Design a protein around this ligand. Structure first.
Ligand SMILES: [Ca+2]
Lengths: 557, 205
């Protein structure tokens, strides 16, 4: 999920510009739901996932808000001490304590029902048990018990009129989520929200801790500790699930890392390119980042250095020259199915070989496959979510940076061989693999483009529509499932705020019994495909002027 | 009037709700949701509570068990029970609004029942505040705020220690899964502020 908020000092023809691209994968019907609420203290417009009471993307005419996943570490695993003599008990603070338990029965269509038990301790629900060591692992979430408060915080924040009122609600959202703010006067802000545990001294948060008492959390850290900034000197706030602040630690998930190689740099490059950005330029950042190969920037220098002394006829050199002439932006050929340049394929094959030769080689099986992915993995329906620099690639980047990396290279990933040698070898593998498939003339290589699919099964893998409702788009775009932009105090309009979004395939998922599709079942699909957008209305005048239908109810509570 | 709920849809079918109190406002919201995405919301409810196999079969038994094992429903219910009338109205209103439409659907299915219900062989039932809350808990808290691999991380560390020795194994773990990396691009510039906490990275536990 990405976001860029442009403040008064970096905006052209406006006081503030907020552009959000939350990435949840693509579905049919739409992942998010468009809604406007007016009354009872609210006056808002926007869209939100699963139609939650609180709008995650929207504005109220005074301020605007958005989010990106925080990826902080708010979950630790406690190793509970069990006893074969006392089943259902665990050792905590010198006493054998009774676990909470509940029976659950799964009813099954055309099958036999299954019942099982779920166990819970003071540290959380038990995930798995190891009778051999007589250990049960409990998952402790810092937000446990604040689930409902977080939903409510996301709702009440919609009524905020300034930074103070908004942060008061941010302090009540307990999940690890980045929150963003912009307003009519040009102010911008950011808060890496959530509850984080105040851990005991010596507690390594990447590994489990004993659950016998001594390692219990002291409580939760105060809101003052949550990374936040209001009106930064840079004039902007950009995020693509990267680190919120210097020295802030990420989630313990092995696949998540915040290091020198990060996709958010692609956004920075575009925002720093020019002194100020207009709303059109800000929106255009979606198009560019959605088509940007994320590895080129990271490894091209290494590739260039390695091929520096080779002759013009050396194929290893030729592959790099191809990369050197490219800005890394992928564009579809007129056939609508292949990419204009073969760079992404070259990088994918090269990077896969490199990882196999370095990180993978240094890690014992079966953990070696945690670092073998190049980041170009897909399905025939295309990527299921956003594209990122793989965890293996991030580690490889630190190794190719040599002394410039702050990460001590405990083990030399190149195993004593010159880096150039390993880089050239991967290039030789690359030439062999690709030349075998496309021939020896690179200029005629038509590499397959990744596509995008609005899936009928929701993110859980559960049908939320009939298979036939699946929709396809030729061009994969590494962008938000939905994109929304709010522009405050435009100098080119008398309105105090302008806002737009796109909710594809459409607002409605309704199909009548006879198969008739609703009038708004697919009217935002093409708009999505070519980076278009529709106006979000807020005021009574605008809503009435663009009114298609109405229904008035009189209900007695 | 206190009992009035006005619903207006724009040119893209996006609804705008007008009401005078909390319960009526959210009732309007729930009502338009039931009109626009009833099958999607029904399947999301089954997904978040682990009741998919009840309508789709044995292919989803493991899924349902996995969902139930990952939360404690009574705890969510207790949070709801502690809400003030004003906050409760958000959830109650929302559920009541969806029920008003679901009731209409089940009364005249011949024209209002979404086709998917016929395709998948079942009909929609009413909702309660707990169900509304679980849509959020199961799709925001569990998907975007429940990430961890500590048990596997420990297995990796053990394997590294076995291959390279104790001190070296710990150092390699720190190379592959560092606690912090000072070269990481940060949304907040270092000139503005830095995180004050320093953490153990030697599995001192
Ligand atoms: Ca942890």
């Amino acid at each position: 999920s990405n976001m860029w908020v442009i403040g008064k000092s970096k905006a052209q023809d406006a006081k503030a510009i907020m552009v959000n691209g939350p990435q949840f994968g693509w579905y049919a019907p739409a992942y998010t739901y468009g809604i406007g609420l007016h009354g009872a203290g609210y006056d808002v417009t926007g869209n939100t996932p699963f139609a939650y009471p609180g709008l995650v993307f929207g504005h109220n005419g005074v301020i605007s808000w958005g989010s990106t996943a925080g990826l902080g570490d708010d979950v630790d695993i406690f190793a509970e001490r069990l006893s074969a003599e006392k089943p259902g008990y665990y050792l905590h603070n010198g006493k054998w304590v009774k676990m909470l338990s509940r029976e659950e029965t799964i009813t099954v269509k055309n099958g036999q029902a299954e019942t099982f038990t779920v166990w819970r301790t003071v540290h959380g629900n038990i995930l798995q048990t190891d009778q051999t060591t007589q250990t049960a692992y409990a998952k402790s979430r810092a937000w446990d018990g604040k689930e409902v408060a977080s939903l409510l915080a996301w709702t009440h924040q919609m009524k905020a009129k300034n930074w103070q009122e908004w942060t008061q609600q941010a302090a009540k959202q307990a999940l690890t989520i980045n929150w963003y703010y912009a307003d009519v006067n040009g102010n911008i802000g950011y808060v890496h929200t959530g509850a984080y545990p105040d851990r005991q001294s010596g507690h390594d948060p990447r590994l489990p801790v004993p659950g016998t008492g001594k390692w219990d959390w002291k409580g939760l850290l105060p809101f003052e500790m949550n990374p936040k900034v209001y009106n930064p000197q840079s004039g902007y706030i950009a995020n693509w699930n990267n680190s919120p602040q210097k020295d802030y630690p990420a989630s313990d998930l092995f696949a998540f890392l915040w290091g020198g190689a990060d996709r958010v740099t692609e956004i920075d490059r575009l925002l720093e390119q020019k002194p100020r950005l207009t709303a059109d330029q800000a929106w255009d950042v979606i198009r560019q980042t959605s088509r940007q190969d994320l590895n080129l920037r990271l490894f091209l220098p290494t590739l260039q250095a390695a091929t520096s002394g080779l002759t013009q006829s050396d194929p290893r050199r030729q592959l790099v020259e191809t990369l050197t002439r490219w800005d890394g932006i992928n564009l579809l050929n007129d056939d609508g199915k292949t990419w204009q340049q073969p760079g992404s394929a070259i990088l994918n094959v090269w990077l896969t070989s490199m990882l196999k030769r370095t990180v993978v080689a240094a890690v014992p099986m079966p953990f070696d496959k945690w670092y073998s992915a190049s980041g170009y993995e897909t399905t025939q329906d295309g990527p299921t979510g956003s594209l990122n620099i793989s965890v293996g690639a991030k580690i490889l980047y630190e190794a190719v940076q040599g002394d410039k990396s702050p990460i001590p290279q405990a083990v030399d990933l190149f195993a004593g061989k010159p880096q150039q040698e390993v880089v050239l070898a991967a290039l030789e593998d690359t030439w062999e693999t690709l030349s075998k498939r496309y021939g020896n003339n690179v200029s005629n290589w038509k590499t397959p483009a990744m596509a995008l699919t609005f899936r009928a099964n929701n993110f859980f893998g559960v049908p939320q529509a009939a298979a036939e409702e699946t929709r396809h788009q030729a061009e994969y775009q590494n962008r938000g499932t939905e994109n929304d932009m709010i522009v405050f105090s435009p100098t080119t309009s008398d309105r105090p705020v302008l806002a737009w979004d796109v909710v594809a395939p459409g607002q409605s998922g309704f199909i009548a019994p006879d198969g008739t599709v609703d009038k708004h079942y697919e009217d935002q699909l093409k708009m999505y495909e070519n980076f278009g957008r529709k106006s979000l209305w807020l005021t009574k005048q605008d809503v009435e002027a663009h009114k298609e239908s109405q229904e008035v109810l009189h209900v007695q509570r | 009037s206190s009992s009035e709920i006005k619903i207006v849809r724009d040119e893209y079918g996006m609804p705008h709700i007008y009401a005078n109190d909390t319960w009526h406002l959210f009732y309007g919201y729930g009502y338009v949701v039931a009109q626009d995405r009833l099958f999607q919301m029904e399947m999301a409810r089954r997904s978040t509570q682990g009741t998919v196999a009840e309508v789709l079969g044995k292919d989803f038994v493991k899924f349902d068990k996995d969902i139930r094992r990952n939360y404690w429903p009574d705890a969510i219910r207790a949070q709801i029970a502690a809400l003030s009338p004003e906050d409760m109205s958000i959830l109650q209103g929302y559920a009541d609004g969806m029920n008003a439409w679901i009731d209409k659907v089940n009364t005249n299915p011949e024209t209002l029942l979404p086709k998917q219900f016929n395709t998948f062989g079942f009909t929609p039932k009413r909702w309660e505040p707990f169900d509304v809350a679980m849509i959020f808990v199961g799709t925001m808290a569990n998907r975007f705020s429940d990430s961890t691999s500590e048990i596997d991380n420990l297995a990796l560390l053990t394997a590294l220690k076995d291959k390279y020795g104790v001190s070296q194994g710990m150092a390699v773990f720190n190379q592959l899964k560092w606690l912090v990396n000072p070269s990481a691009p940060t949304t907040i510039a270092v000139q503005e502020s830095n995180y004050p906490l320093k953490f153990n990275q030697q599995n001192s536990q």
